[PDB]
C-alpha cells in the first residue's frame, strides 16, 4: 500500500532525530508537513529501523 519513495543520495544524520539514508533505500515517507517535521524543507519517514526527519530533496517518488 504505501507509496514508493527512493533515497537519491546518502545522508549522514546530525542528530538522533534525523534519518540516515543510503542511496537507493526505499524510504517510508510519513509526512511532508513542516509543522510535523519541525523544519521547513524537511520531511519525516522511516528507514533502517529508525524514524526521523530528512531533507526533502533527498527522495524521489517511484
Residue numbers in the entry: 41 to 102
Task: Quote the authors verbatim.
MLK3, also known as MAP3K11, is a serine/threonine protein kinase involved in regulating the JNK, p38, and ERK pathways. It is composed of several modules: an SH3 domain, a kinase domain, tandem leucine zippers, a Cdc42/Rac interactive binding (CRIB) motif, several linker regions, and a proline-rich C-terminal tail. The SH3 domain has been implicated in the autoinhibition of the kinase domain through an intramolecular interaction via a nonconsensus single proline motif located between the leucine zipper and CRIB motif in the full-length MLK3 protein. The overall structure reveals a five-stranded antiparallel β-barrel, a characteristic of all known SH3 domains, and three loops (RT, n-Src, and 310 helix), commonly involved in the recognition of both proline-rich and nonproline ligands.
We solved the X-ray structure of the apo MLK3 SH3(44–103) domain at 1.5-Å resolution and refined it to an Rwork/Rfree of 18.6%/21.7%. The final model has all residues in the allowed region of the Ramachandran plot. The sequence alignment of the SH3 domain of MLK3 and five other human SH3 domains (Src, Fyn, Eps8, p67phox, and Grb2) revealed that the n-Src loop sequence of MLK3 SH3 contains an elongated insert of five residues. The residues that extend the MLK3 n-Src loop form a 310 helix, which is not commonly present in SH3 domains. Comparison of the unbound and ligand-bound structures of MLK3 SH3 domain revealed a closed and open conformation of the n-Src loop, respectively. As modeled in Fig. 5B, the closed conformation of the loop precludes the peptide from the groove. In particular, residues Ile-77 and Ser-78, which participate in the 310-helical structure, as well as the following Gly-79 undergo dramatic spatial movements required to facilitate binding of MIP to the SH3 domain of MLK3 as demonstrated by the change of positions of the α-carbons in these residues.
